Write a protein that binds this ligand. Structure first.
Ligand SMILES: *[C@@H]1O[C@H](CO[C@@H]2O[C@@H](C)[C@@H](O)[C@@H](O)[C@@H]2O)[C@@H](O[C@@H]2O[C@H](CO)[C@@H](O)[C@H](O)[C@H]2NC(C)=O)[C@H](O)[C@H]1NC(C)=O
Ligand SMILES: *[C@@H]1O[C@H](CO[C@@H]2O[C@@H](C)[C@@H](O)[C@@H](O)[C@@H]2O)[C@@H](O[C@@H]2O[C@H](CO)[C@@H](O)[C@H](O)[C@H]2NC(C)=O)[C@H](O)[C@H]1NC(C)=O
Ligand SMILES: *[C@@H]1O[C@H](CO)[C@@H](O)[C@H](O)[C@H]1NC(C)=O
Ligand SMILES: *[C@@H]1O[C@H](CO)[C@@H](O)[C@H](O)[C@H]1NC(C)=O
Ligand SMILES: *[C@@H]1O[C@H](CO)[C@@H](O)[C@H](O)[C@H]1NC(C)=O
Ligand SMILES: *[C@@H]1O[C@H](CO)[C@@H](O)[C@H](O)[C@H]1NC(C)=O
Ligand SMILES: CC[C@@H](C(N)=O)N1CCCC1=O
Lengths: 420, 110, 592, 420
C-alpha cells in the first residue's frame, strides 16, 4: 500500500515499493556508522537527495487523500540567527503548487499549496526553554494525514497535535521529483537527520499509524536518550525519568560506599534561545557484554551484561550483597577483581511481557538466575540510594505504576553542544 | 549608606586576559571591562558592580557575592562552577552558551 | 756520641715511666683532662662559626661570590699557619706557655671579629683567630700525653676527643638559640649595625677565655723541663702530681720517694733571640725528617693527608648536596604563565616561584608588591608605574620598558637582564646591596639540626674506640675504621633524597671517628718528647691544607655527578689505610 | 674686525657690521619671549635663515685665516634614531667646497673642504651618559678658528678641545650665501637654538676668545641651569654645585623645621642612549621682587629679593633667626605672615668684586643692611642643613675656595624631557 519507501541497502538507497523510483544522492551526504539507515543532511548545495516517482503516481487530483511518515532529528538552536529563519527541508512544489515540510525555530510545519496559491499550514511547536525535552536533538516520529474533504492532521509519535480544515483548497498539483535538502537556511552549520520515509495514497487512521510507530520503533533494541542504538564500551550519563533533576554519584569506594541520586542539575542558557538543563552531569555507566553472542556492538533485549562505573576516570563494577536486610538493598561500585561471588549480572529490558515498547530498565540477577529485581532508587534518611528489588516486578505483575525502575542513557552528542 | 556610596571607587576600561585570580573586592564599580579566557577561582565580592563589561571564555569557581550585580554585561562561552551568581544578579545581561554547575544554596532574592 | 745520647734518652724515659707509675692515675689527671678538654672544645667550636653566620653576613656586609667561599675557607688557612707555628714554638717555650699565648690570640681576635663591620677586616680577624686556635690540638695532646703511664695511654688519650664533639653541639645549640632572632637590631652609632650573628660570634668566643682561665691553674709538663736541662721544677711538678693523687685517694701520708732524676745535659737582643728561636725550631723540624724518623714521618704525612682530605671533603659535600636537592625540588614546583594582557589595572600582590612569559602590560600601576623568585620574560611594559616594590631573586629578562616609572622600588640595574628601558625613570630607590643576597628563614633551623645529628653521630664510635684503644691496638683500629669509611663512601650511591643524605652523613661521621682517634693516639706515641709537638703541629697543618683542598674539590662537584666524590674519597681512604697498615706498633712501650 | 654679526632688532634680524648682508627668514622660525635674540630652528623646510654677504667679503683665498663664533643649545637625544645621523645645521659650501657646521649624536663637527675635495674635520664630543652635563640642553659658546698655515682649532666655552692641521688643504671657496637650517636629520622632532653668530677675518687667539666669551655672557644678569635668563614668579629646582647628588628638601614647617639636602637623585635612562640624573627632584624656589625698580621680570645683579619655597604646592618664605648659636645658622621656610622681623632680605650675586662671571649665589642680609652671609650648606650629625654664614665671605676675602655657596636654578624644560 506504500508508494515510496526509501530504505538503505548495500551502499545505496532503494525503494521497497514496486515502483522503482529513481534515487540520486550527493557527494556530501553522511551516514551513521552503526545505524546507516539514518541519513544526515548538512547545509550545503551538494547535500541533496533527489527521488523521481512515476507519472502514474504523481499527485494531480483534488479529492485524493494522502499521508506520509518519517523520523526526524533536529539539533538544538544555539544563537539568535536561527530566529525567524523558516527554511525548507523537503519540497514537492512545482509552479507554486504542492506539499512541503519545513523547520523553524522550535517548529515543524506542513504546507499545502493548490493551483490557486492558497496556503494551508499545520504547525507543531515544541518549546526550547524546558528543563528536559522530548524533542530537542531527539528522534521524532512525524506523520501527516491529508483528507481533502475533512481536514489535515499532524501526528508526533502517534498523537494528535494539530489539525486544520482543507476543504477550501482546490486542485493540488505535485512535482515529479522530491527534494531532500535544507533550502533557505541562513545558518551555515545547521544540519538535520532523517530516516524511514514512507508515502501512502490515503488518509491513515490512529490504529494504522500507531502500528507503524510500533513496527519502526525497533522495540527489541535498546535505545539511549537521543534515540540511537545502545552500544557497549561507551560511557553513558544516567537519568531517572521519575526524578530527572538528580544524577547518579558515588561517595566512597567499595561496599561501604553507596551510589546515590545527587541534585540539582545545572543549566545551559543563551538568553531567550534556550534555558535547558545540563545532561552531562554524574558518573558514566559503561556496559560490558557477558553472554551476548551477537558480534555487533548494539545492545539487544534480554541481554545479560555487566555495568562499569567511571569514578575519577577509573572503571569499577556494579555489585550488591544478595544476603542482607530487606529487599530494597543497596548497590555499590567496587574494584573490578574484588567482587567475588557478589551479584553482577544485569538483564536489559526494553519491551514488556505483552510486547509494548517502554524505556530501558536493568534487572539485577544472581549467578543462580534468581531475580534480585529491577534496579531503582529508594529514600533512606532523605538520601536516594540505588536499590535492586522485586517490588517493581511485583507492581509489574499487578499492572501497577512502578516508581524508579526506568533509566535513560545520555552520551555526549554534538547536537546538544554542552561543554563538559 | 550615603557615606558608603561616597567612598565607592570606579575603574573604567579594564582589560585582563589569560589571568588566574583570587581576590576580595568591596565597594567598587568596574565599567567597560574586557576579560578573555580568565579564571576566577574563589573570590568574594561585596557591593561590587560590573557594568558594560564583556566576559568571553571565562571561568568562575567558588564565587561568593553579596550585593553584587552584572548590569549591561555580556557573557560568551563562560562557565559558572560552584557559584552563587543566581539569575537575579544578572540585570539586563546577555549570557551566550553559558553553563551553571553545582550552584550554591541561597535565597531566590537578595 | 749518638749512642750515649740514645742511652741517656732511654734511661730518662724508663725512669719517667717508673715515676709516673709510682704517682698513678687520679684527680690531677682528670682535672688536667677537663682543662685541656675546654681548650679542645674551643677548637671544636671555632669551625662552625662562619658557616653558621654566612647567611646573615652576606646581607649585612654585601658579600658576593668568591667572598663567601674565602670567608668559609679562611679558618682552615688560619689553623694551618697556627698549628705549625705553635707546634714549633712549644718545644722550645713549653707546652703550657704556647697554649696560653695561642688561646689568648684566639680569644682577642675572635672578640674583635664580632664588632668588625667590613669584610677585609673581618677576614683578617677570623684568620688571626684561626691562627690562635690552630695550635690547640697538637699542644693539648702532646701536653696531656706526658702525664700518663704506659698501662692505659690509648684510652686516656682517646677520652680527650669527646670535647671536640661537645664543642660542635655547643655551636649548633647556640646557633639555634641566637641566630634566628633577626629582629635584634641594637644600634651603637648610626653608620653601624649589630645583629644577632655578632652575639653568636661573641658566645662562640667565650669557651676560649674559659679554657684560658682553666689553664692558668695547671703546671707545666715535667718532661719539657727534663729535656731542657731544668731539674728542680720538674721534680716539684711530679711531687705535686703524686701529692694530689694520694690526697684524693685517701692516703695523705706517704712521701714522694723520688730524689734525683736523670736530666738531658745541655751543651739587638730581641733580634738575636728571635734568630736563635728560628734556628733550633728549624733544627727540630729537620730532625723530624731524620734517619731515625723518616719512614714514620712519611707514613704520618700520607695518613694525615688522606684522612683529612676524605673527611673534610665529604663533610662539606653532604650539606651542599642537601641544598642542591632542595633547590631542584623548588624548581620543580615553578608555575608558568604563557601570554598575559593586563591593562589599566592597579595592583598589590605577592608572587612566589613563578615565570610570566610573553606578557603585555599597558598603563598598569604596580603599587606595593613583593616578588620572591619571580621571573618576567619576553614581557612588554608600557606607561606602567611601579611603587613600593620589594623583590628577592626577581629578574626582568628580555623585557621592554616604555615610559615607565620606578618609584620607591629596589629594582636595581642587575635585575634587568638583557632588558631595554626607554624613557624610564627611577626615583627614591631603596637602600640595598649592589648584587643579589639570599635570605634564609626556617631553612637555617634544619641546617643546625643536621649539624647536631652529625656531631651526635660521632658520639657512639668515640666510646667504642675509648673502650678498645688499648685492647685491640692503634694500627688495627685505624685500619678497621678506614675500611668502613671507604665502604660508606662506596655506599653513597644509594641516596638521592634529603633524609637519605642525612642518614649517610650520620653513618660516615660515626664511622670515621674511630680512625681519627687512633691516628691522634698513634701520632702522640710515635715521637720522642723533644719533637712531639713540632711533628704533631706539622701534621695538623698538613691536615688543614688537605681540608682546604678537599673542601674546594668536593664543593666543585655538587650537582654534576655522584661518581667523582665517591671515587676520590674511596681512593684516598684506601691509600690512607694501606699506608697505616705498614706502621710500627706502639701499643706497649715507654713514651719516647 | 667682524664681518657678520646677526643680532635682533625691532621684529627682524640685522647685521652690526658695516656690510649690510641681506637676511631672509622663513615662516616657521621662532623666538624666545624673554630673550628674542635667540633663534629656534626646527626640522622643516620653511624653518630657514639665509644670509647673503657681499662679493668683496666672500672667502675665496688660500692664505686667508678666519674664525666663527656662536652660542648653540642642543636638546637631548632621546632614541636610537638620532644615532649615526650626522646632520648639517650651518652650510656654506658650493660646488663641494667650503666650511660647514653640523651636529651628530653627542657631537659638534666643523668641516673644511677645498676645491680638491679634501676634507678636514674638527670634532667636540660630549657624553650623554654623565649624571649632570654642562652641554646637554644647555647653552654652549662655540668658537672655531682656522689658520691656513698651521692648524684649525675648536673652542668650547673659551677652552681648547681639538686642533687638526690643515696645511695640506688647498684653495677653499665659499658660498655667497650662508645657511641656517637642519639639513639631513631623520628625526622629525629635532630642533636647535642658536644666538649671536659672528664671523671674523682672522684667527683669534685665546685672549680675544675669552674677552668675547665674557662680553657676550651678560655677566650682570643671573642665569639659570639651562643658561637662559632668571625670572621672578617662576618655580626653580635647586642644585648645589659642590654637592650635585642631593636636592633641597624640607621636613617640618616653621622655625622648628629645617631645610636640608636629601639624596641621592634618581636617574633617567634610555638604554644605550642616555643615563642622566633626575633634575626635577626636590623643592621649588620662587623669587619675588622687593626693591628692584626694573619693570621687567629678569633678575639682575645686586638685586634685593625674597625667596618663596614651594612645599606641597604652598608658598612659604625663607627666613632665619639672626640671634642664635654660631655663625652657621639654620634657615627655614615659614608661613608668609609669620616672618615678622626675621632675616629674609636676600641679595642675588652673579659676578664677583672684580666683575668675573661666576655661578649664582645668595647673600642673606637683615633689615639693618648687615650681611648674614652667603647661603650654603653644612653638616650637623650627618644631616646637611642650609646655613647662612659669613665664613664664605671670609674665604672670598682671603681668595680661598668657597665650599657650597654656589647654586643652580633648574626650571622645567622641553628639551630635557624628564617626566615630573
Ligand atoms: C554555542 O555552542 C555551540 C556548540 O558548541 C559547543 O558548545 C560551546 C559552548 C563550546 O564549548 C564549543 O567548544 C562546543 O563545541 C556552537 O555550535 C557549534 O560550534 C562549533 C564551533 O566550535 C561548530 O564547529 C559546530 O558546527 C556548531 N554546531 C552547530 C549545530 O551549530 C555555537 O556556535 C556556539 N555559539 C556561539 C555564539 O559561539
Ligand atoms: C621620550 O621622551 C621625550 C620627551 O617627552 C617627555 O618625556 C616622556 C618620558 C613622556 O613623559 C612625555 O609625555 C614627555 O613629554 C620624547 O620627545 C618628545 O615627545 C613629544 C611627544 O610626547 C613631542 O611632542 C616632542 O616634540 C618630543 N621632543 C623632542 C625634543 O623630540 C620622546 O619622543 C620619547 N621617546 C619615545 C621613544 O617615545
Ligand atoms: C584564594 O582562592 C583559592 C582557591 O579557592 C584558595 O585555595 C585560597 O586559600 C584563597 N586565598 C585566600 C587568601 O583566601
Ligand atoms: C550598555 O548599555 C547601552 C545602552 O543601555 C548599550 O548601548 C551598550 O552597548 C552597553 N554596553 C555594552 C558593552 O554593550
Ligand atoms: C597592598 O599595598 C598597599 C600599598 O603598598 C598597602 O597599603 C596595603 O596594605 C597592601 N596590602 C597588603 C595585604 O599587603
Ligand atoms: C626575546 O628575545 C629574543 C632573542 O633573544 C627575541 O627574538 C624576542 O623578540 C624577545 N621577545 C620579545 C617579546 O620581543
Ligand atoms: C680533636 C679531633 C680532631 C683530630 N685531630 O683528630 N678531628 C676529628 C675529626 C676532624 C678533626 O680535626
Amino acid at each position: 500500500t506504500s508508494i515510496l519507501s526509501i530504505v538503505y541497502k548495500k551502499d545505496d538507497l532503494i525503494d521497497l515499493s514496486r515502483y522503482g523510483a529513481k534515487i540520486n544522492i550527493g557527494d556530501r551526504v553522511y551516514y551513521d556508522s552503526i545505524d546507516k539507515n539514518q541519513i544526515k543532511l548538512i547545509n550545503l548545495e551538494s547535500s541533496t537527495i533527489e527521488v523521481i516517482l512515476k507519472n502514474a503516481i504523481v499527485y494531480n487530483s483534488m479529492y485524493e487523500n494522502f499521508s506520509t511518515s518519517f523520523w526526524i532529528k533536529i539539533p538544538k538552536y544555539f544563537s539568535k540567527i536561527n530566529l525567524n529563519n523558516e527554511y525548507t527541508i523537503i519540497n514537492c512544489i512545482e509552479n507554486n503548487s504542492g506539499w512541503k515540510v519545513s523547520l523553524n525555530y522550535g517548529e515543524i510545519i506542513w504546507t499545502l499549496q493548490d493551483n490557486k496559491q492558497n496556503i494551508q499550514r499545520v504547525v507543531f511547536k515544541y518549546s526550547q526553554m524546558v528543563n528536559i525535552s522530548d524533542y530537542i536533538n531527539r528522534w521524532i516520529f512525524v506523520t501527516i494525514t491529508n483528507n481533502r474533504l475533512t481536514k489535515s492532521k499532524i501526528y508526533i509519535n502517534g498523537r494528535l497535535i494539530d489539525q486544520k480544515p482543507i476543504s477550501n483548497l482546490g486542485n493540488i498539483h505535485a512535482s515529479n521529483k522530491i527534494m531532500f535538502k535544507l533550502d533557505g537556511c541562513r545558518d551555515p552549520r545547521r544540519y538535520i537527520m532523517i530516516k524511514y520515509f514512507n508515502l501512502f495514497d490515503k488518509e491513515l487512521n490512529e490504529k494504522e499509524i500507531k502500528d507503524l510507530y510500533d513496527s519502526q520503533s525497533n522495540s527489541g533494541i535498546l535505545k539511549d536518550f537521543w534515540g540511537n542504538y545502545l552500544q557497549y564500551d561507551k560511557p553513558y550519563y544516567m537519568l531517572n525519568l521519575f526524578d530527572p533533576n538528580k544524577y547518579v554519584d558515588v561517595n566512597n569506594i567499595g561496599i561501604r560506599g553507596y551510589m546515590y541520586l545527587k541534585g540539582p542539575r545545572g543549566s545551559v542558557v543563551t538568553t531567550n534561545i534556550y534555558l535547558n538543563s545540563t545532561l552531562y552531569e554524574g558518573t558514566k555507566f559503561i556496559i560490558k557484554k557477558y553472554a551476548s553472542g551477537n558480534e555487533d556492538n548494539i545492545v539487544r533485549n534480554n541481554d545479560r551484561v555487566y555495568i562499569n562505573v567511571v569514578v575519577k576516570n577509573k572503571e569499577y563494577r556494579l555489585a550488591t550483597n544478595a544476603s542482607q536486610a530487606g529487599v530494597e538493598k543497596i548497590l555499590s561500585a567496587l574494584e573490578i577483581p574484588d567482587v567475588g561471588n557478589l551479584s553482577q549480572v544485569v538483564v536489559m529490558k526494553s519491551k514488556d511481557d505483552q510486547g509494548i515498547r517502554n524505556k530501558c530498565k536493568m534487572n539485577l540477577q544472581d549467578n543462580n538466575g534468581n531475580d534480585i529485581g529491577f534496579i531503582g532508587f529508594h529514600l533512606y534518611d532523605n538520601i536516594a540510594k540505588l536499590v535492586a528489588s522485586n517490588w517493581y516486578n511485583r507492581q509489574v505483575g499487578k499492572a501497577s505504576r512502578t516508581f524508579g525502575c526506568s533509566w535513560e542513557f545520555i552520551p555526549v552528542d554534538d547536537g546538544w553542544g554542552e561543554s563538559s | 549608606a550615603v557615606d558608603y556610596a561616597s567612598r565607592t571607587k570606579v575603574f573604567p576600561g579594564e582589560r585582563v586576559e589569560h589571568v588566574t585570580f583570587n581576590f576580595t573586592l568591596e565597594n567598587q564599580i568596574h565599567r567597560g571591562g574586557q576579560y578573555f579566557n580568565d579564571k576566577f577561582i574563589g573570590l568574594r565580592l561585596k557591593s561590587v558592580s560590573f557594568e558594560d563589561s564583556l566576559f568571553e571564555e571565562c571561568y568562575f569557581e567558588d564565587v561568593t557575592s553579596s550585593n553584587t550585580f552584572f548590569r549591561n554585561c555580556t557573557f560568551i562561552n563562560t562557565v559558572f562552577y560552584n557559584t552563587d551568581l543566581f539569575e537575579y544578579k544578572f540585570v539586563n545581561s546577555r549570557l551566550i552558551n553559558s553553563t551553571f554547575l553545582h550552584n550554591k544554596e541561597g535565597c531566590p532574592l537578595d
